[PDB]
DNA sequence: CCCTGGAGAATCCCGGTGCCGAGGCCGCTCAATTGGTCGTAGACAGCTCTAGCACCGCTTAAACGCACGTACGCGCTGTCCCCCGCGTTTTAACCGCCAAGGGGATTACTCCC
C-alpha cells in the first residue's frame, strides 16, 4: 500500500482506484486526506445499517457528488431507503450552516 | 473483672489502647476489639521469640537470654528472617 | 518523671513459656524496639487501610488483615489462631 | 495462560532494553521471574480486595499493591 | 438452554450434514487393556525357581 | 512472479541486511516508543486465569488491568539495562543467565 | 547551596 | 451509582459491604 | 510502678469498646486460619550447639563477658 | 476566602481542613495552613518551568507526558529527591556506550 | 470532591500561560500534591512523637529534614512570607 | 574521632561530642562497610576475576541505589 | 582539610584482613571516596535531626533515628 | 588502497485533513475565618548534673618501605557456536446475520378520586 501510494500524491498518475469494501476501514486515514471527485457503491446491500462501522467511516467523506449502486434495493427495512436519502443528501459544508 | 484477665492472656489491652489512639484520623476512630486482637498477637509473638531464646540459652546453659540467641532463632525460623527483612 | 514499658509483662510471658530463663538488659532492649515497631506498623496500616475503605468501622479486622499483609504466613497464621480464640474466651 | 508473553513481544521488550544480541536460552527464566511477580501482585490485588470484600477489583487496589511492595508506580 | 437464535443451526447442520460430519463410523478395534495379569507374578516365582 | 501481476515481478531482489546496523537502528526506533507493546487483551486473559484460584466471582475492571500492565512493563526495563551493562562489563556482548542472576542478587530479590 | 545547577540548565 | 453503604449504614453488624464498582452496574451498563 | 500501669490499663480497657459505632465483627469471627498448628502457646523445639549452625545456613560471652555480666538480670 | 487572605493562588482552607482531618498528632498549630502549599506550589511551578522549556524544544504546545518524564528525569536533583516512581508513558532518556557505537 | 484543577490552571498561567494540557496530566499533578502532602506529614508526625506535644515551625523543620537544602531554603523563605502574609 | 569533628563542626561550629553516638557510629559503619566488601567481592568473583577494578564496584553501587 | 589525611595503611590492613590478591591504589582511593561520601550521607541525616532535638550535643538517640531512618 | 559518483532513505518540517479539549457560562453550593472561651502546655527562670575536654606519658603494634617472586587479566593468536534476517505458514479478533426477548410506561380497560 504504501509503495502504490508513493506516486499517488503530488501528480495525475491515476484516475480509479481499485478498492475493496473493507480495505477503506482500515486505511481511512490516506483515504479521507484526498478529495474525490466521485465515488461508486457497487453492490449497495453490503452497507445497510446506519449504526455500521462502514457507515460511520464513509459518511463523511469530502466529495461532491455520490452515487450507490445495488443488483435490488433492500426491502422489508424503509430505514435502509432513508439511509439511502441521507447518504444522498449530505449537509456538512464548510461553514456549517448551509 | 479487669479485660485483660477475661481475655485469659497476659498481655494488657490497655497501653496498646493507648498507643493506637495516637494513630486515629479525625472522624476515624479504633475499636477496643482491635486492641485486644493486637494484644494478642503481641503476647504469641513474644512468647514464641522467649521460648526460642529461652531454648538456645539452655543449649548454651544459660539462665539468661542473650541477643545472640535471638538473633540465632531468627535464623532458625526463616519466617521471623523474613519478617525482620521487611519491617 | 515516669516511664512506661513491657518489662513485668515479658517476664511473666517469658516465666510462663521458660520459667528458668530471664531476659537480659539489651535483649529486652531489643524485645521492645522490635514490639513497639511492629505495633506502630500494624497501627499505620490499619489507619491508611480504613481510610481506604471509606468508612470508620475499626475492628479487630483491621489488626487481622495487617497481620496478614506485613507478616508472611505460618507466624501470621499462628497469630490469628491465638487471637480468635482469645476472642472468642472474651466474648 | 503460561504463553502469555509470547517470544515476539519477549524478544521486543528486549531491544526495547538496548540489548546488541539476545540469545535463545534467556525468555524462559525472564518469563518465570515476571510470573512470580504478577502471582505475587494478583495475590496482593485480591487480599486487599476482600479489604470490604468488594466484588471487584480496581486501580486503587494494584496501586496500593505496588506502593507497599516497594516498585512504586505513577502516571495517575 | 434458554438462547435459541442457533437453536435451529444444529438443525440445519443435521438436515444438510447427514451425521457424517456430526460423528462417522470410525475403523472398529477391541480394547486395549494392558495391565496384564503377571504384571506382579514374575517376582513370585522367579524366586521359587 | 505468482501470477498475473503487474508486467514481470521479482523486484524485491536480494537485498538482504546484515546485523548490528539494522540492530542499532531498531534499538534507536525502538527506544523512542512509550506506548504499551504487548497485547493487552491476552494480559488480560491470562490474569484472569490466574485470579480464579484465590477465588471465582472477583470481577475487574479497566483501570486495574491497565495499572497491572503499566506495573509490569515499567519495571523489567529497567531490570533489562541492569542485565545490559553486567552484560557489557564482562566481555559478553550477547545476553546469558550469569549475568541476570548477578543483576538479581544486587538488586536485591529477597 | 545557593544555586547549584538551577539556573544554568 | 447505588453503593451498598446503606446497608452497612442501617445496620452496624456488618460494615464490610462499603463500597462497589460494579455491583451498581451503573457505572457500566447505564 | 507496676501497679499503677495495671490500673491504668485496667482502666483504660473500658474506654475503647463505647466510643462510637463499633459493633465489632458482628460477635462473629472466622475459625483457625488454614490449619490449626499453633500448638498449646508454641512450638517446643531447640537448637544445638555443634556445627548445627553449619548444617543450619547450608540448609537456607557475647561482646566478652564483661559486658554479659554488665547486662542486669531483671527483677520484678 | 482563604486564598485572598492568605494571598496564595493554591487553596489552603480546604488543605488545612484535610490536615485537621488527618490528626497526626495531638499538638497541631494551625498558624500555617499554607506552608506545605506554599512548598508543593514551588516544587510544581519548577516542574512546570521544565516541562514548558522541554514541550517547547519539540515544537510541542501541549505536554505530552514523555515531555513530562524528560522533564522530571533531566535533573540530578529530581532523580535523587525520587526516583523510584515509574510514570506512564515510560522511555528512558536516550543513552549509548563507548562500545556499542564507535 | 475537592480537586486542585483551578489551581492547577493558576499555577499553569504563572509559569507558562501559554502552555497547555492534556487530559491526564492534572491527576498526575493532583498526585504529586497530595501525596507529598501526606508524606511530610507523616515525617513531621514521627519526628515530633518522641518530643513532648499536645505549625510554621514544624513544617519548616520537617521540610529541612530531608527535602534537600536547595529547595529547603526556598520553602523556608515562602513560608515566612506566607505566614506573615497571614498575620498581616 | 577527629573525621566526624571535621565533618559535624564544620556545618555547624559548637558540637559537643559525647561519647553516645559514637561507638555506635563505628559499628554502624563496619556493618556498612562489611556488606559493600562483601557485595565487591561477590561481583569481582562473578567475573571470574579476583582482583578488583573500578567499574566493578562502580556498578554495584548503582544497583545499590546511590 | 583533614579529610585527605586519612593513613592509606589502614585501608592496606582492611584489605589484607578481607582479602583479594591484587589491591592497588585505586581500589583505597576509590574506597575511601564512597565511604566518605556514605559518611557526609549518614551524618547530614544526623546533624539535622540534632538541629530538630532542641539540642546541640551529639546523642545516641539521634545516630538511632538516623540509622533507623535509612535502615 | 582513499576518493567520487550513485542510489535507498532518516530526518524536517511542512503541509493537509479530522477531531475533540480548556475553559468559560450558568447553577449553586460547602466550608474558613471571624468571635469568643476552655484549658493547656511549652518556653522563661532555677537547680543542677554528669561524664567530655583535655591533660598527664610509656608502650606495644600500625606506619610503612623493600626484595623475592610468581599469578593471572589481558595482549595477541586460533578454534568455532547459533543470533538474525529473508521467505512461509498457521492463529485471531472484528464486522456483520440471523431472530426471539427487553423493558417503563402510559393510555384502552376498569376501578379509584
Ligand atoms: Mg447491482
Not at chain 9, 469498646?17 to 475459625?31: F, H, K, R, V
Request: glycine share 6%.
Amino acid at each position: 500500500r504504501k509503495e502504490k501510494r508513493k506516486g499517488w500524491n503530488k501528480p495525475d498518475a491515476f484516475h480509479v482506484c481499485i478498492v475493496s469494501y473493507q480495505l477503506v476501514v482500515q486505511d481511512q486515514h490516506s483515504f479521507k486526506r484526498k478529495r474525490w471527485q466521485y465515488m461508486v457503491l457497487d453492490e449497495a446491500h453490503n452497507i445497510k445499517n446506519f449504526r455500521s462501522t462502514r457507515w460511520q467511516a464513509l459518511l463523511n467523506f469530502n466529495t461532491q457528488r455520490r452515487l450507490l449502486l445495488t443488483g435490488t434495493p433492500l426491502q422489508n427495512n424503509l430505514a435502509e431507503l432513508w439511509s439511502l436519502l441521507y447518504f444522498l443528501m449530505p449537509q456538512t459544508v464548510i461553514d456549517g450552516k448551509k | 473483672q479487669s479485660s485483660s484477665a477475661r481475655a485469659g492472656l497476659q498481655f494488657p489491652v490497655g497501653r496498646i489502647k493507648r498507643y493506637l489512639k495516637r494513630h486515629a484520623t479525625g472522624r476515624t476512630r479504633v475499636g477496643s476489639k482491635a486492641a485486644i486482637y493486637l494484644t494478642a498477637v503481641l503476647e504469641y509473638l513474644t512468647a514464641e521469640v522467649l521460648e526460642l531464646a529461652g531454648n538456645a540459652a539452655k543449649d548454651l546453659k544459660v539462665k539468661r537470654i542473650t541477643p545472640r540467641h535471638l538473633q540465632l532463632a531468627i535464623r532458625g525460623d526463616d519466617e521471623l528472617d523474613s519478617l525482620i527483612r521487611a519491617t | 518523671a515516669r516511664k512506661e514499658t513491657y518489662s513485668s509483662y515479658i517476664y511473666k510471658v517469658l516465666k510462663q513459656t521458660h520459667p528458668d530463663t530471664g531476659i537480659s538488659q539489651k535483649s529486652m532492649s531489643i524485645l521492645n524496639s522490635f514490639v513497639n515497631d511492629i505495633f506502630e506498623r500494624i497501627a499505620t496500616e490499619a489507619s491508611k487501610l480504613a481510610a481506604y475503605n471509606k468508612k470508620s468501622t475499626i475492628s479487630a479486622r483491621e489488626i487481622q488483615t495487617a497481620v496478614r499483609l506485613i507478616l508472611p504466613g505460618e507466624l501470621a497464621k499462628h497469630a490469628v489462631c491465638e487471637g480468635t480464640r482469645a476472642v472468642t474466651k472474651y466474648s | 495462560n503460561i504463553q502469555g508473553i509470547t517470544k515476539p513481544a519477549i524478544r521486543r521488550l528486549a531491544r526495547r532494553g538496548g540489548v546488541k544480541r539476545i540469545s535463545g536460552l534467556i525468555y524462559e527464566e525472564v518469563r518465570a521471574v515476571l510470573k512470580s511477580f504478577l502471582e505475587s501482585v494478583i495475590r496482593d490485588s485480591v487480599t486487599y480486595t476482600e479489604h470490604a470484600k468488594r466484588k471487584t477489583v480496581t486501580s486503587l487496589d494494584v496501586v496500593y499493591a505496588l506502593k507497599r511492595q516497594g516498585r512504586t508506580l505513577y502516571g495517575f | 438452554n434458554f438462547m435459541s437464535i442457533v437453536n435451529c443451526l444444529m438443525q440445519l447442520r443435521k438436515v444438510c450434514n447427514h451425521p457424517n460430519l456430526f460423528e462417522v463410523r470410525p475403523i472398529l478395534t477391541s480394547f486395549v487393556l494392558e495391565h496384564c495379569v503377571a504384571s506382579d507374578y514374575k517376582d513370585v516365582e522367579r524366586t521359587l525357581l | 512472479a505468482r501470477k498475473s501481476a503487474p508486467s514481470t515481478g521479482g523486484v524485491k531482489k536480494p537485498h538482504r541486511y546484515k546485523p548490528g546496523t539494522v540492530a542499532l537502528r531498531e534499538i534507536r526506533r525502538f527506544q523512542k516508543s512509550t506506548e504499551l507493546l504487548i497485547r493487552k487483551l491476552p494480559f488480560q486473559r491470562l490474569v484472569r486465569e490466574i485470579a480464579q484460584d484465590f477465588k471465582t466471582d472477583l470481577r475487574f475492571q479497566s483501570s486495574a488491568i491497565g495499572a497491572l500492565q503499566e506495573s509490569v512493563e515499567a519495571y523489567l526495563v529497567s531490570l533489562f539495562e541492569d542485565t545490559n551493562l553486567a552484560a557489557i562489563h564482562a566481555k559478553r556482548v550477547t545476553i546469558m543467565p550469569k549475568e541476570i542472576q548477578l543483576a538479581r542478587r544486587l538488586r536485591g530479590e529477597r | 547551596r545557593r544555586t547549584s545547577k538551577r539556573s544554568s540548565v | 451509582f447505588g453503593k451498598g453503604e446503606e446497608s452497612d449504614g442501617d445496620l452496624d453488624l456488618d460494615d464490610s459491604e462499603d463500597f462497589t464498582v460494579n455491583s451498581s452496574s451503573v457505572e457500566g451498563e447505564e | 510502678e507496676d501497679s499503677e500501669s495495671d490500673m491504668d490499663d485496667a482502666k483504660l480497657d473500658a474506654l475503647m469498646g463505647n466510643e462510637g459505632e463499633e459493633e465489632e465483627d458482628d460477635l462473629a469471627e472466622i475459625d483457625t486460619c488454614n490449619i490449626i498448628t499453633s500448638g498449646r502457646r508454641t512450638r517446643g523445639k531447640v537448637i544445638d550447639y555443634k556445627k548445627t549452625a553449619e548444617e543450619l545456613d547450608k540448609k537456607e560471652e557475647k561482646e566478652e563477658d564483661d559486658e554479659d555480666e554488665e547486662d542486669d538480670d531483671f527483677k520484678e | 476566602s482563604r486564598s485572598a487572605k492568605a494571598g496564595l493562588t493554591f487553596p489552603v482552607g480546604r488543605v488545612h481542613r484535610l490536615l485537621r482531618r488527618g490528626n497526626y498528632a495531638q499538638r497541631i498549630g494551625s498558624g500555617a495552613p499554607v506552608y506545605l502549599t506554599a512548598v508543593l506550589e514551588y516544587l510544581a511551578a519548577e516542574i512546570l518551568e521544565l516541562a514548558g522549556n522541554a514541550a517547547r524544544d519539540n515544537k510541542k504546545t501541549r505536554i505530552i507526558p514523555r515531555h513530562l518524564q524528560l522533564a522530571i528525569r533531566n535533573d540530578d536533583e529530581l532523580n535523587k529527591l525520587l526516583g523510584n516512581v515509574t510514570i506512564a508513558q515510560g522511555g528512558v532518556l536516550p543513552n549509548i556506550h563507548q562500545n556499542l557505537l564507535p
